[PDB]
Amino acid sequence: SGFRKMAFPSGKVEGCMVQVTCGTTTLNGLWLDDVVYCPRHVICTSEDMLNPNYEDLLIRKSNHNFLVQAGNVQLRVIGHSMQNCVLKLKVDTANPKTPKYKFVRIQPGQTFSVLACYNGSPSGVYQCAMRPNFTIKGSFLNGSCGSVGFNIDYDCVSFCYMHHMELPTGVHAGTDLEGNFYGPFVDRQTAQAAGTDTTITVNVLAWLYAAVINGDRWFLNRFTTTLNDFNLVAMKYNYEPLTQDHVDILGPLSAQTGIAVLDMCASLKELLQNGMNGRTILGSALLEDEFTPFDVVRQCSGVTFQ
Amino acid sequence: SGFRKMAFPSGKVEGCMVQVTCGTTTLNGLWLDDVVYCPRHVICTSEDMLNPNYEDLLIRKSNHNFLVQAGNVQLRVIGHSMQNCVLKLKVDTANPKTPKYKFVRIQPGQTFSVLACYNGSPSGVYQCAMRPNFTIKGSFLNGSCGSVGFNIDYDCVSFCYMHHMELPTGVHAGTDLEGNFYGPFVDRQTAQAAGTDTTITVNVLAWLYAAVINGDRWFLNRFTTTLNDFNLVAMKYNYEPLTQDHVDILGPLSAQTGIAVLDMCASLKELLQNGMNGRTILGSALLEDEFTPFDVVRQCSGVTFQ
Ligand SMILES: [K+]
Ligand SMILES: [K+]
Ligand SMILES: [K+]
Ligand SMILES: [K+]
Numbered sequence: 001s002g003f004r005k006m007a008f009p010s011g012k013v014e015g016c017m018v019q020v021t022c023g024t025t026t027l028n029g030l031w032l033d034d035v036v037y038c039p040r041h042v043i044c045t046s047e048d049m050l051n052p053n054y055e056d057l058l059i060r061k062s063n064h065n066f067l068v069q070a071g072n073v074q075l076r077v078i079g080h081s082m083q084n085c086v087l088k089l090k091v092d093t094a095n096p097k098t099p100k101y102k103f104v105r106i107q108p109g110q111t112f113s114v115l116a117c118y119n120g121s122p123s124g125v126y127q128c129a130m131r132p133n134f135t136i137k138g139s140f141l142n143g144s145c146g147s148v149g150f151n152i153d154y155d156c157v158s159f160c161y162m163h164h165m166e167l168p169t170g171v172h173a174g175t176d177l178e179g180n181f182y183g184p185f186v187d188r189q190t191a192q193a194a195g196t197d198t199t200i201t202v203n204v205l206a207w208l209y210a211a212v213i214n215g216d217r218w219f220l221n222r223f224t225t226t227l228n229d230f231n232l233v234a235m236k237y238n239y240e241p242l243t244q245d246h247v248d249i250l251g252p253l254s255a256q257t258g259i260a261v262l263d264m265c266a267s268l269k270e271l272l273q274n275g276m277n278g279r280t281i282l283g284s285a286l287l288e289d290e291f292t293p294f295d296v297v298r299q300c301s302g303v304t305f306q
Numbered sequence: 307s308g309f310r311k312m313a314f315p316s317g318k319v320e321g322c323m324v325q326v327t328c329g330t331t332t333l334n335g336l337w338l339d340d341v342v343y344c345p346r347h348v349i350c351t352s353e354d355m356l357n358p359n360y361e362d363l364l365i366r367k368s369n370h371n372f373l374v375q376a377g378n379v380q381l382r383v384i385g386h387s388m389q390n391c392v393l394k395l396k397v398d399t400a401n402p403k404t405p406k407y408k409f410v411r412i413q414p415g416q417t418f419s420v421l422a423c424y425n426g427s428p429s430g431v432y433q434c435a436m437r438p439n440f441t442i443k444g445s446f447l448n449g450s451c452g453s454v455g456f457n458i459d460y461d462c463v464s465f466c467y468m469h470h471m472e473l474p475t476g477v478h479a480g481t482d483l484e485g486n487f488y489g490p491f492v493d494r495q496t497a498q499a500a501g502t503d504t505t506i507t508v509n510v511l512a513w514l515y516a517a518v519i520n521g522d523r524w525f526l527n528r529f530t531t532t533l534n535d536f537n538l539v540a541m542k543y544n545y546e547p548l549t550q551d552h553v554d555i556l557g558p559l560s561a562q563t564g565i566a567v568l569d570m571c572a573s574l575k576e577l578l579q580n581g582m583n584g585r586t587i588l589g590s591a592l593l594e595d596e597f598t599p600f601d602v603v604r605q606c607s608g609v610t611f612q
Contacts, residue, residue, distance in 0.1 A: 001445065001447055001472065001476060002444050002445040002446060002477070004432040004433075004434075004445040005310075005311050005432060006422070006429075006431065006432040006445055007313055007431050007432065008431070009316040009317070009320050009421065009431055010315040010316050010317055011315070011317030011320040011321070011428075012317075014315050014317040015317070071612075116312070118608050118610045121611065123609065123610040123611065124313060124314060124315065124604075124605070124611075125316065125431060126310040126313065127311075138307075138308050138310070139307075139308040140307065141307075141606075141607075142608075143608065170307035170308060170521070172308070215476070283443075283592075285592050286586070286589075298430070299429075300447075302447040302448075303429060304424050304427030304428060304429045305428055305429065306377075
C-alpha cells in the first residue's frame with residue numbers, strides 16, 4: 001500500500017497567505033481574522049539587521065510603512081504591534097477564508113507540513129521535522145520568510161512554525177506563531193551555531209512500525225532489551241534518548257502491529273550495530289526519522305481532514 | 307537551500323473531492339462543473355470484479371443507485387455515462403469551486419502531486435512519478451480509488467491521474483481523466499504483471515544537478531562519456547535509455563550548474579558501478595529518480611502558483 005513523505009492538504013492555509021512589504025524587504029505574512037502575522041525582521045534594512053533594536057525600529061514605523069497585498073487586493077494596515085519576533089499588523093479586513101486554527105509550540109521530533117510561499121503566493125507543500133537542534137531541513141529560497149508549518153486535526157489548523165531565516169549550513173530556523181524562536185536563535189545577522197543534530201529515535205521506531213504494517217518483517221529479531229540498555233546503545237549512534245512518554249505514544253502502533261516497543265527497540269539496536277546488509281526498509285537504505293507515530297497511523301489508517 | 311519531495315498546493319483540488327457510493331462500494335470522485343468522475347469499478351460487486359461486463363452492469367444501474375456526497379451535502383445524480391474506465395455522473399449542481407483545469411495524459415518519467423482521499427475527504431498530499439512500467443509507487447489504502455494526481459501551471463490544474471487499483475506488489479495503477487489506463491492494466495480482478503520497473507535516468511541526472519546546486523560535488527568525477535557508452539552501462543543496471551531529447555531537456559540545469567550532461571552521465575556511470583561508499587546525496591543513500599528536470603528548476607528557482 002506504500003509509504004510516502006505525505007503532507008497535509010494545503011487548501012486551508014493557502015487562503016491565509018499574503019505579501020508583506022516594508023522598506024526593501026518583501027516576505028510572506030499569515031492573514032487570520034483581521035491580523036497579519038509575519039517575521040518582524042521585515043522592518044529592518046540590511047544595516048539594521050546587523051544589530052537591530054526592534055522596539056525602537058518599530059516605534060519609528062507607521063502603519064503606512066507596511067504594504068500588505070492579498071491577491072490583487074491591498075490590505076490597509078490600521079495598527080501594528082510586536083509579539084516576540086513576530087510582527088502583528090492589524091488590518092481593515094477580516095480574512096473571509098480564516099479556518100479554525102490554534103497556535104501550537106511543537107517539540108523537537110514532531111513533524112509538520114510546510115507551505116513554501118513567495119510574494120504571498122504558495123509554491124509548494126512538503127513534510128518537515130523539527131530537528132533535535134531546533135532547526136528544520138526545509139526547502140526555502142529568498143522570499144520564503146513568513147511561510148508557515150502546520151498540522152491539521154479534523155478541521156483545525158495548528159500553526160506551529162513560521163520561517164525566519166536560513167543559517168549558513170543551509171538549514172532553516174523560525175518561530176512559533178507567538179514569535180518565540182525554536183532553539184538558541186535570534187533574528188539578528190550575527191553568527192549562530194546550530195547545536196549538533198541527533199536522530200529522532202521515536203520516529204525511527206514509528207517508521208519501523210510502518211514497515212511492519214507494509215509487510216517488511218525481516219528486521220524483527222529474536223533479541224529483547226530494557227529501555228535503559230537501549231538508550232545506552234542509542235546514545236553511541238547519536239540517537240535521542242527514548243523516554244517513557246515516547247514508549248506511551250508508540251502504544252497505538254504497538255497495539256496495531258502486536259509488536260511491543262521494547263521488542264521493536266531490540267530490532268533497532270541490531271540495525272544500528274550491524275547495519276542493513278544492503279537491504280532496504282520501505283524503499284530506504286537509511287533509517288528514516290521524519291515520521292512521527294501519529295504520521296504513521298494517519299497514513300496507514302487513512303485519516304481524512306474536513 | 308534544501309531539497310524536498312515537494313507537492314503542489316492541494317487547495318484547488320480539495321474542493322473537487324466527493325464521496326461516491328454504489329451498492330456497498332465507497333470511493334472518491336472528482337466534481338468538476340456538473341460532472342463527477344470516478345472509477346467505473348464502483349458499480350461492481352466482489353463477484354462482478356472477476357469478469358465484469360461494464361456495458362451490461364451499467365445499463366442495469368439507475369441514477370438513484372449512486373450516492374454522491376460533497377461535504378455534508380448530497381448531490382443528486384441526474385445522469386450517468388461511461389468513458390473508457392471512468393464513470394461520469396451528471397449531477398444537479400455545478401461545483402462552485404471548479405478551478406481552471408485540463409485533463410492531460412502524462413508520459414512515464416513525469417511526476418505529479420497526489421491528493422490521497424477517503425470518503426471524499428483529503429488525507430494527505432505527496433509527490434509521485436509515473437514509473438516506466440506505467441505504475442505509480444503511491445501511498446494508498448482501501449477507499450483511495452478515485453483519488454487524483456495533478457500538476458498546476460499558473461492557475462490551471464492539469465489532472466493527469468485517477469487511482470483505480472493496487473497490484474499484489476503494492477504499487478498502484480490508474481487512468482487519465484478520460485478513463486484510459488496507463489499501461490497494460492484493466493479494471494478486472496485478474497492477474498496482471500507490471501512490466502519490469504526501470505529507473506528514470508533523466509530524473510536521476512536532474513536530481514544530481516539538484517545536488518550540485520545544493521553544494522554536494524563529491525560524485526563529480528574526472529571522466530566523460532558518449533551517450534551510447536552510457537546507455538550500455540545504464541541497460542545493465544535497469545536504467546531507462548537516455549535519449550537526445552533527455553539531454554536537451556537537461557539543458558537548463560547543465561547551463562545553471564555549468565556541468566555538461568554527458569559529464570554528469572559519467573558521474574552516474576561511476577555511481578552505478580562502484581556505489582556510494584556509505585556517502586549520501588541530498589540526504590539519500592539511494593539514487594532518487596522521482597524529480598524531473600523541471601521539478602528541480604521549479605524548487606531551486608522558486609516558481610509560485612495562483
Ligand atoms: K526592510
Ligand atoms: K525482538
Ligand atoms: K510535477
Ligand atoms: K564527470
